[PDB]
Structures are given as structure tokens and as C-alpha cells.
Design a protein around this nucleic acid. Sequence first.
DNA 1: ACTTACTTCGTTCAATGAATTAAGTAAGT
DNA 2: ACTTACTTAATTCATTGAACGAAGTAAGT
Lengths: 386, 396, 396, 385
Amino acid sequence: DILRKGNKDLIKDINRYTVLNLIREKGEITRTEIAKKCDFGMSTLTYILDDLQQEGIILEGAETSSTGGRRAKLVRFNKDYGFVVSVKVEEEQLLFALTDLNAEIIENTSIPFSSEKKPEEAIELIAKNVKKMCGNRDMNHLLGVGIAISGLVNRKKGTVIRSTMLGWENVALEAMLHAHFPDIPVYVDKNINCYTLAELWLGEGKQSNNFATVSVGAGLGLSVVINRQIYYGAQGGAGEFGHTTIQPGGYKCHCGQKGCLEMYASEFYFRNRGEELDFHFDKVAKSARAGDEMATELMGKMGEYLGYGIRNIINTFNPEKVIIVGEGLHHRDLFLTKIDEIASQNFFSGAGFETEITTTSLEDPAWLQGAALLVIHQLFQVPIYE
Amino acid sequence: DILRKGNKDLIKDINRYTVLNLIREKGEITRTEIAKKCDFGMSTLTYILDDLQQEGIILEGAETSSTGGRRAKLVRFNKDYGFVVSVKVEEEQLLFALTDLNAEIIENTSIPFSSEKKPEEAIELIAKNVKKMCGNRDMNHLLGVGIAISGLVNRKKGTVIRSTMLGWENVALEAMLHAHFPDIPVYVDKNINCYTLAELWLGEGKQSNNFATVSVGAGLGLSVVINRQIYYGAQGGAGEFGHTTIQPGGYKCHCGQKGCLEMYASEFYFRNRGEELKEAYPTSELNDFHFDKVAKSARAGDEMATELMGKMGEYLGYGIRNIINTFNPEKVIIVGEGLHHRDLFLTKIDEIASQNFFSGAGFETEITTTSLEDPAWLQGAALLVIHQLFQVPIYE
Amino acid sequence: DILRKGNKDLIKDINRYTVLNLIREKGEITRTEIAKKCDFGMSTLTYILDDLQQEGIILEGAETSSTGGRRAKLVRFNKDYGFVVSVKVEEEQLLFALTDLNAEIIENTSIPFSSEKKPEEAIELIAKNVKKMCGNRDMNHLLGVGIAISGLVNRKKGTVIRSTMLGWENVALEAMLHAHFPDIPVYVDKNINCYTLAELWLGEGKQSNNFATVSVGAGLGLSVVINRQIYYGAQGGAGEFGHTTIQPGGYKCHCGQKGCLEMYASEFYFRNRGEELKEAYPTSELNDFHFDKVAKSARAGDEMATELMGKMGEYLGYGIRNIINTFNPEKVIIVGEGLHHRDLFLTKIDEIASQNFFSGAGFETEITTTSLEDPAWLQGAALLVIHQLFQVPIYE
Amino acid sequence: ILRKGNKDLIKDINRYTVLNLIREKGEITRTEIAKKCDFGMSTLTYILDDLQQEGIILEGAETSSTGGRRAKLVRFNKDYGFVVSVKVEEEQLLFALTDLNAEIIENTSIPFSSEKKPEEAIELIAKNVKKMCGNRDMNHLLGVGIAISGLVNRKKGTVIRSTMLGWENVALEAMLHAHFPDIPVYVDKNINCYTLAELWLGEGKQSNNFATVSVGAGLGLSVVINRQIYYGAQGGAGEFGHTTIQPGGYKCHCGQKGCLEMYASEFYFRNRGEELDFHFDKVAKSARAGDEMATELMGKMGEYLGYGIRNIINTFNPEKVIIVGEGLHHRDLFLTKIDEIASQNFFSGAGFETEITTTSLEDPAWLQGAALLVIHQLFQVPIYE
DNA sequence: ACTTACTTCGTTCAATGAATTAAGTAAGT
DNA sequence: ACTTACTTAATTCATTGAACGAAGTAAGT
Ligand SMILES: [Zn+2]
Ligand SMILES: [Zn+2]
Ligand SMILES: [Zn+2]
Ligand SMILES: [Zn+2]
């Protein structure tokens, strides 16, 4: 990523994208609020807003109440300038959503398919629905495709390095969709990252710039947001906190290591510990509340493991806030008090800074909205790099 | 941390700082090569270079070999445009260095003084030493002061929130030094971040853009660099991997928690475990629990010191394996006075840490040791000032 | 010296100073009358008036009676936005005044002190007095210091080149005072120019734009105003009509020349001619040669005093006739100490001076006396600051 | 009244200022304009475009390269228009058609006894003005400038009185305006017109301050301070020639007794002569030949002129005095005496010397000066209304 | 002759900030 | 229903200063 040369195009783009983003955030806003918050004289907004309206990305809104005074006319973000299609690839099915530029779902469908070991066919099935959801619309307005998957992703290339869930290896997902949509960006990322984009744009991100998102289900996912940016490692390759070692020589994990955190702090623990003594999360939780000794032990220890996992996310990253999301299970059923009891005693609370641990305020559609946000985030990012 | 308004001042800064940096990294370069690398027409570069030469930060170099073609004149970075003073605060001494703008040490000195619970005294002594390090030079050429410290730092306010090692609490370091030097920037950061900065500019960073820096010795420090940027959490507050819990209900750490990685993967382990092992190995020759002493007794064959040293290596290995799984840093660079005894732990670290999530998927993470000497801690502190002064000021 | 560049800062100043002066001139006026007079739309005036009110130099006044008609609100000049200190330097005393922005005297005092050949002592005493004159007020509201002096002045540099009456030679008055008050303008001008400013702002200037001001007393001073501007010659150096030669090879004057008008048309003449007459009138009751004493004995019927007074009135008349023929001032205002005994010379002045070039062509030049009192010299000095502060800054 | 502050005022200030620098130099590079007027080259892009669009400047020749694309000189169009100047004398009416530099293109003299025939004189002016433009487009005529001997009301353009011509209350401008309603017409005294010539073509090329003193049949004085001529109330000029130097002295034509010009001008010869040929040239020559009466007249006129000039220096502080002969050769005056007397003054006594010298200009300057009445108005920065 | 390197002169365009138009409210007769 | 007096919203245009383009010189192979 090299910084763009300093010139007039860079000046125009910076001011138009910044003003545009404030308008997105508010939905509607007066020229005067934009001026105060972005430090622009009204005459500069004359040219910026004129260009944006000419593109069709903003619209004239309603007249505001008079305070003197000529009545101001609201500047409205055109959420329908275009649309996005998002896809979520699951074991049993392919979920789809056509969304507006606010990531609000307009249409959604589900196509059942056995995606395990047949990526070629899954891609073609994706390409088909993408074309079908735009069947009663103009495909010029299709601004991109966003894909959420469970696995390891090379974001530099848009390839799925590995997906244990689906039995995929080195699938050039983006390359294959690009043959069907050459002018349309196609982005793939892991589920936890798509969900985190949903929190950033629709959830916790509306009041915080820093938080960590922890998904607990069949595995444990972690995505850290610092200053409204998600942390990725080298070459854009995401870190894998779920596969940190907590017990040397412990349960054999599907990643090839022994003793991974997610083998103790996720639903996998029930499967593992179960065999050593039904183990689906919801049944185990019910049985626990009913006082079954085995079910209470599993829920209790998973809660302890999760607690130490979350404490270490806090100590390692200094996220300020941790959001727990259930992935295929209801997080309110977790031993939340234990998790909080353990993780709230950390390095930073010891020094006078509390870190709040809470649960998501978003619903299931957020996974798909997040996948769409992969595209929207890219479209509205101030283009200072090349 | 917000983007500046798009205007002529912004683009003027983007271009002149980008050109300046290109000249600075190459030491010497021609106008044609700058123009080609930066996509400028010659007239554009002409004006940018005039401003820089008039400031005195670049100088005319010698001519180069012909390629056609008139002989192009090199443009040279004036490494002596100004100078920097760096400081490293330790329990029993204060270290000082005066560097050029490439962070090369021109002078350095150290003094005995106990800063333990004596912040006003230490700070007054540091101010006098900054003045003395300038010697006969022009004070107007002092570009800043950079300070490496062991503790918890608020980089925004320049305050040391806490340093358990020094017994300091809520010390307005930057502000107190601004009372003596009002017209110059003064920055403070953790020791590990200073060293990483030195690594970024003078070591591993010259050839790679991603790496984790792990200091082993009297403690355990971690800093991660991704795409030439050091990771910091919320509000610019550093992460604290050394204070991750590896053993619930384990050794009490100076941070208030129990079972921190630092209590098992550093010198602290020898004192914690040593107390427990004394009666189990009565014949042992270990008189002291400092790193160098434990290394000598283990390398001599003492059963207790080999257990202590080998166990510390194991815990360190698992710590590094978890650095890899968590951050995906591409490479891990081990650092610190603990390397003086690398022969005793590097093999165990490599055995444990080479098996990780990423190696399971076909990506090997190199684990190596630093190629920088001990002065890098001081150079790193100097680079706090240099990094900040040469950074393209895109943010306001 | 030259006109400012045409840009937004210039037009901003032209408009806000023009509106400010309109308000200041009228004391209180409405937005509508300003807009009417200055040809502005109401929105334009709204912004100009916001700036002025925010600075605190105009205030919101009371409502005006309806014209049919929402009630228009008066805009008032804040005469107390700041204050000014003025000084008058005499041989035997230093006079001080503190004035509001209408040049109205709030306070004034005087002190005995011999400034003769003692500029440094006098200037130190003036500086301590400026400080004391401020009293309980905020020094930040002292807009300046204006000084009236008898002598030759370089107004650019603020230096007294020469003052024969004080024995001062190349005294950097303004620079020496700037040592005490660096952020405050300090102006110096001759007594006659100070009084003329007072006349321009508080007296004759309220009704007319052209007049010559002539001071009679212990000297003769002239200042000419045409189109509300005081005439100055080359480099801003004042003209010196009092030092015109009326009698070749005549009385030696303090300026180095012989026969100057001032040696015949002022008190100086009583001393020069008095010396030559003593023996021709031994019986005469006239002891002293000061103005009032000569007037007393002449009004009592003394042959010597009547001759001295009659002649000086005659020479004064010819001096004024030539002021008229030379400048075409439209009006001549007589001023000074000497007015106390106007009954003895005003008739002769009128007889001689009313017959002039312009009266011969049908244009009569009115010759009158000032309607201002003694404090006008101090007010004039204060007006050096006020004039300069409220002047539309079109030059630089 | 100052003009309101707005964009038109901004435009005019910068265009007129840049235009004036170009007139001063004849030709100049855009870079010198930029450095002299503190403008960025891009601001000049628009200023020079507007001025070229008007046809008041032209593209000049290229300049020697210094690196370096060659700069193209920006040239003042002295022929954008022309001016007609008139000088009203006792025996004749002189005329000149000049370019915008006041350089004489065409000139003529129309013999006429203007004494007591004002309407007629004005009709000859209007006709010759109309004829001077016989071979040139009339809309290029930018104004008419008239130099006259006498008293002038400049607010109205009327000749209040001219003793030379026996005119009284003649509405010169009003009468010419009937023939040239779109053309400005300016009237002023000869001395003021000559001073404009000095200011643009002579002493004004090296000085911002000077007094011009004409010595002929009468004594004229015009004072320039900071490149502006001093006028009295309502623009009515002062009359230093009619200051009293001798109470009950020679009866002057202004109605006063003892005026300076009755002693320090050629009138002194006529006056003193009768009390004992008195034309200046004959008296000067007779004096050089040792005639006792002629030497006395020349000696005393010199002393009187000397005291007159000393008092101009003392009154006005002009920095320098320029002596001009009007109908006579100034070099024939007792210049050393004038200098001896006048150089001892108030200001030289205080360390500031005042140079007294003679004009470097020739006779056509009177007419060039009258044309400059119009030119000075056209090129003045319109900051007022 | 060709190439490469550097310079200086002069233009374009986005932002800026002053007046100014656009379109109301505010409060009387 | 008028009339006059204020307010706030949003636009125009001359200047500005950054890159950029025009059109040369400079000094080699
Ligand atoms: Zn695993
Ligand atoms: Zn700890
Ligand atoms: Zn004198
Ligand atoms: Zn006369």
C-alpha cells in the first residue's frame, strides 16, 4: 500500500469521501452540521455536495425547522445508489442477501447444498444466485459480492487456504467468481471478521471505537477492532486465537496441534470431554440447569476456560471492550458470570482501567450483513492509498 | 486520530515528506530516480527540492556515471541537520545518548542513581543531562528527547501511569521535562517498543515488514509489527502479552495478577521456583537467582539450575508458539541480555514453537535472534523522535 | 506609503472600519441607516456587526420608535472598549491624561520636573506615569500612548530630532518607551499637530473639512487641514511656517536662521524688541516681557507695551494673510494662550488678513478663534492613537 | 468617499496597480511584476489576461534565457488611445495630440487674440480638437486637457478669472462638454500642468517630493508631496506668487499691494523700471555688459526670488525645488544668489539639505503636462467615488 | 544525433472567504 | 395586508498556491 501522490485529485477525493461518510453515518444531515464537524466553509460544501449529488450518491431531503431564518434542506444519503450481494457458505447450505448501501437486507434466500469436497459446484451455485437475485434489478447497480466462510483465507488473493468444515483446500474463490463478474469486486473473509464489521457499523461500533468480538460455537473466533480497524497479521492473514495452546499434550485439534483453546472453551469441549466419560450445547445447557452432574461440570469448566481465554484477549490486545457472540448457540446460556468473574480481573483493571465484557445486541442476520459490509467498507474508504 | 482536511498544505506535506524519506532511506539518490519512483515531473521535484535545500535538510552530492546523457547530481540527506538526545531509565542508572538523524550514536554516557520512588529527582537529573549531552552544540538543533522506560505509559499525555520496577505512579514525565525544554517534543514509551522501533529502522525492518519482537531477560516483553506499524491497543495503550495468564492460581506477579507468563518465561521464574526448589536439591551450587548465575550453574551440570533453566525455556517456547498463533507475525525475533545464554533455550523454543497453527497449514514462521547490539535500546528511544518527525503528517 | 494588495483581507477591513466609524461618529445608529448609508444588504451588515460585537467594540442599544415598522434596534459604539494615555512635555512640567475612545478626559494630572537637557530622566518619569495613570484598570485595555511635544519630530521613527525649548537632540522617544510597553503603539507629534487633531475631531472639524490652525503665545504654530487631512511635507516631516523669513537680517531665532515670523508674531517679539526699547521708554511701567504682563501694561495705556503689542499684532496679521494666500484654507482658526488677550490683536489681524488674494477674487476666508478649551492639547495627543487605530488601513 | 469593499474593488486595485508598473517601465517581465507587487504568477495569469483582453497591454518580445524558458515581455499599449491637450495663451492657442505616455504625436498653433472673446476661443478649441482627430478614430480620444493662466475652479472646470485674457467666470468645461459629452475635460493652471510633466517625465523619475517654481510674468508654485500635488480647499490651488512681501508695496493685478511676484518675477522690471527697455532678456544682457540699472534689477530680483524660495522650503518642506523659466531662460537668473539665500533654511539648519535646481525639461512640457491632466486621471487606482 | 538532466516561465483547478442572493421569521402599523 | 427589521441558508467569484505543462538550456555519449 503506497500513499498516493499529493495533488488535486487526492484533495477532491479526500473531502468528498469524508463528507460522504458523515452523511452515511447520519443518514440525513444539514450542510451546517457537516461544516462544523468537518471544518469546512459552506462555499467549499457547495462544490463537494454538488459533485456528490451529480454522481447520484446523495439526494435532496426534507426542509428542516426554521431557526431564524431560511429553512435548511437535509442532505440525504442515497442508500439505493446501488446494492450488494452477500453470501454465507455453510456445511448444509448457501445463504444469500441482497442489501442496500446501509447493509439493510432487501432480499434473502437459502439454497441447500452439500458443499463438502465439491467447491467447483458450490462456486457455480453461488454465481447462479448472484445473477438471480439481480433478476428484477439493474446489474450495473451491483457494486460487489461479499462472502463469509468458515476457514483460513488468503485475503491478498481471495483464496480459501483451508476449510476443515467444508473439506476445501486452496480454492481460488475470488478468481472463479471474477470469471463471472469481471467488473465487480469479490471479497472473502472468515465469519468472525464479517460479524465484527456488522458490530462496527450496526452494533457496538456506534458507541465504541475499540472492542474485541469473540464468537463461541463449534470453535472460538476472535476479531479485534482498534480505532475502527480490524487487526490482521502478515499479508492480511488473520490471527487465530482459538488455536492458541492452553494445554500441552491436550485434546487433539483439527488444526494439527494439541491443546488448543477452542478444544476447551467452545462446544468442541463437550464432544471431547464427553467421550472420556447427548453432547450438543443446548441439551447440555438444559441438563445442567436440571442439575445433571456431568452437564454441570461441562458447562462449568467450559465457562472457566472461556474466562481465561477472554482474560488473555484483554491482556494481549488491550481492547477496552469484549463482545461475546453465540455462533450456533445462545450466548445467554453460557456461564457468563464466571467468564466475567475471571476476565474482569486482568492486567488493565489492576492498573485502574476497567474492561467491560458484554454480549452482542445483534441478531443472526448480522453474519450476512457483515459479509455485505466487506464490500461497503471498501467502497466508502477514503482512497489515500494505491 | 483523524485524517486532515484535503487541501494544499496537506499535499505539500505529502510530497516533500515522501521525497525527503526516499532520500533518507537511500542516503543518496538522483533527481531522476526520485522523479521515477515518485511519479513526478522534473519541475515539480525542482520546487520540492529547493524548499528542502533551503531548510538545509538535504545537500548537493557528487555526480554519477553517465547513462546517455548528462551526468546526474546526487541529492544527499543531511544527517546532521539536527540531533536527538535519548534516555533509558533503569532502577540503578540513567543512560544517555546523543544521536544523528539516522539514529547513530555520537556520544553516550551513563550515571549511577537510584530512581526507585524518586521521580522528581530522576527527572531533574535527566533534564541537566540532556543539557550536558548537547555540550558545545546549538540548542536550536536539538530536535527532541526520547525516553525508554520499564512500565505502563500514556503515550498521549506522556505520563508514566505506573512502573512497578521503579515504584513510580502517575508521573507527568513529558510535562516536567517541558518545564525545562518548552520548545521541543519529548516522547516516552516502553523499553520493548523502543527496541522494536530500532529493529524497524536499523535491523530486521530493513528487509521485512512484519515481525514480532520478544525480549527475554529480567522480564518478557512483546511488540508486534504488521506492515511496518507497531501494534498498540485502545487509546494507544500497549498490549501486555507478558501478563497473560499461563497458570491459573500461579505465582503472584508485580502486576497484581497471578500466573502471568512473565513469572514463568523470564528471570522472575528462577526466583519464584528457586525458593520452592532449595530443599529438594540441598547439595546444589546455586548461590544466586539472577539469569547469568543460573546459566553458569546449569551449564556446569547442577541438577537444580538445569531444571530451572530448561523449564523457563519450555514456558518461553509455549509463549512464542502463542505469539505466532495469535498475531501471525511471519517472523519472531528474540532479543535481550538473555540471548547471552541462547545455547540453553533456543533449541527448546524452536522445538515447541515451530509446531503452530500456521505451520499445520503450510506456512512456516521463522524464529531467529536480533542482529542489533545493546545500544539499540537507546537508539530506539532516539527513534521515537525521529519516527515522529519524518512521518508523513496525514493525521491531525 | 503604498496601497495594500487587493484581496479579501483588504475589503474586510474597508467594510468593518467604515461601519465602525459610522457608529463611532453617530454614537448610536440603527442597522437600516448603516445599510442605507453604506450600500450594504442586511445580511452583509449582519456578519460585519457580529464580528464587531464579538470583539466588544459595539454594543446593543435601545429600540427606536416604529416607522410602520418593526422597532429597529440601535447599535452603540463602546467608548470604553479600551483607553488611551496622553502626555504633553513642557520645560517645567509633564502633563498626563487618560481618555476614553472619544478622547474624553477621564483623569488628568501634572507634575513639576525640568526636562531641559534631561530626556532619559523625563522618559523614565513618563513611563512610570503612564503605568500610574492606568491605576486599577487592566493594562491589556491600554490601546496606546500619544505625546505632544515642542520640537522637530521624525514621526516614522518616533524620535525627537531636536527640541530647542527642551535642549533635546536625537532622542529615540518611542523606542525608549517601547522598552517599557513593547506591545502598545506610542506616537509623538508637535503640539500644533496634536491640537489640530483635536480641532478635526472635537471642534471645527465637526462642521468643516478645511481649516488652518494657528497657535499664538510663546511661539507661532501652523497646521493646515485640507479634506480632513493634516498637511505634512517630505517623509512626513512637518512644514514650519513659523520659521519663514519676514525680515532678512532680523532677530536671531532659536532655529539658527535670522528674521523668522515667530520672532515677530509671538511672545518672542516682546523679548527681542523689548531689549531695544527699554531706553526709549525709561518711564514705562513694564517690568517683565511675558505675554500676559505686556498685555496688562498695554491695556493700562503704557506707551512701550502698546507699541510692542500693536506691532506683534500687525506682524501676526501679515503672517495670517500669507497663510491664506499660500494654502487657501477656507477658514483660519486662531488658538492658544494668547487668546486670553485677544481684544488687543484680533481687530488688527482681521484688518490686514481679510484683504487677501482670494477676497480680491470674491472668496472670503473666515478668521475666527477656537471653541476648544486648554485640555485640547492633551486630547490631541490622545487622538494620535485614536486616529491611527480607527483609520481604514488601506496603506502599509 | 471610499468605495465599498467587494470583488470589483479587488479587481480594479490589482489591475490598475499592475497596469501602472507596466506604464512606468514601458515593458516588463511577469516575474518583475510578481516581485514588485507581491503577486503569485497565477494571479498575474488572470490580471494580465483581463488587461490584454481590454487591449491596454500587448505581447512584447522575448528576453534572454536564464535557464530556462524565455520570458515574453508585457508591453504597455501607449496607443490604446490618445489625448488632446490645449494651452491657452494671449496670442495663441497651442494644441497637441499625445499618446498615453504624453509623447507628442501631432502639434499645432492657432493664432488668436483671446482677450475678451471667451465663447469664440472655446469654439476654436472645439473645432481644432475635432480636427486633431482627422486621421484617427474619435472614440480613441480619451480626454482633453487644458492649461491656462489664471484662477481655476477645478470642482466645476470653470476659469474664475484670468487677468491675462480678461476672462471672468468662464464655464470652459461646461462649454466643451456640449461638444464632447463622453469625453472628460480638465482645466488647470500652467504651473500645475508643468508639475505633472516633471512628475512623469522629469524630476519625478527620481523623486517623490519637490516644489516647482515658475519664474516669468508672475511666479507660480506647485508643491508635490508623495507624488501628489498640493491643492487647497475644494481643490482650489494656493497662490504663493501673491503672498505679501512688502506692505504698501507695488500694486498687483490681484488687487493686493506688495505681492511676491511684483518683486521676484519679470513684473519687478516693469515696476522698478518706471520708477527710474525692461523685458527680461534685454535686462539680463545689459546686466552682463555692466549697465548699472540692469545689474541692480537683476541683483534685487535674485535676492527677492531667493527669499521667496527659502520660504517655500520652510513652509512646505518639499526636499527639493525645481526652477522653471516661463517665457525666459532660467539659467540667466541670479541662480547662485537664489541658492545662497534659500539653501540656508530651517531644515538645513537641522541637518536636512534641500537641493535647489533647474528643470531638465523643455517647452513642450507645458502641453505634455496638460495632456497628463487626463492621463493621471485615467490611470489613477479607482479606490474612491 | 541522440540522450539524458535540469531550469525557468507561465497555466489550471480546488479550496477559501468575502460579499451577496434566496427565502424565511419577527413584530410592529 | 402592508411595512419594516432582522436571520439564517446557501451561492458566486478573485485570489491563492500546489502540481503541472510549455519550452527552453546544459552537458554529456
Ligand atoms: Zn487448533
Ligand atoms: Zn503480570
Ligand atoms: Zn526660526
Ligand atoms: Zn498679487
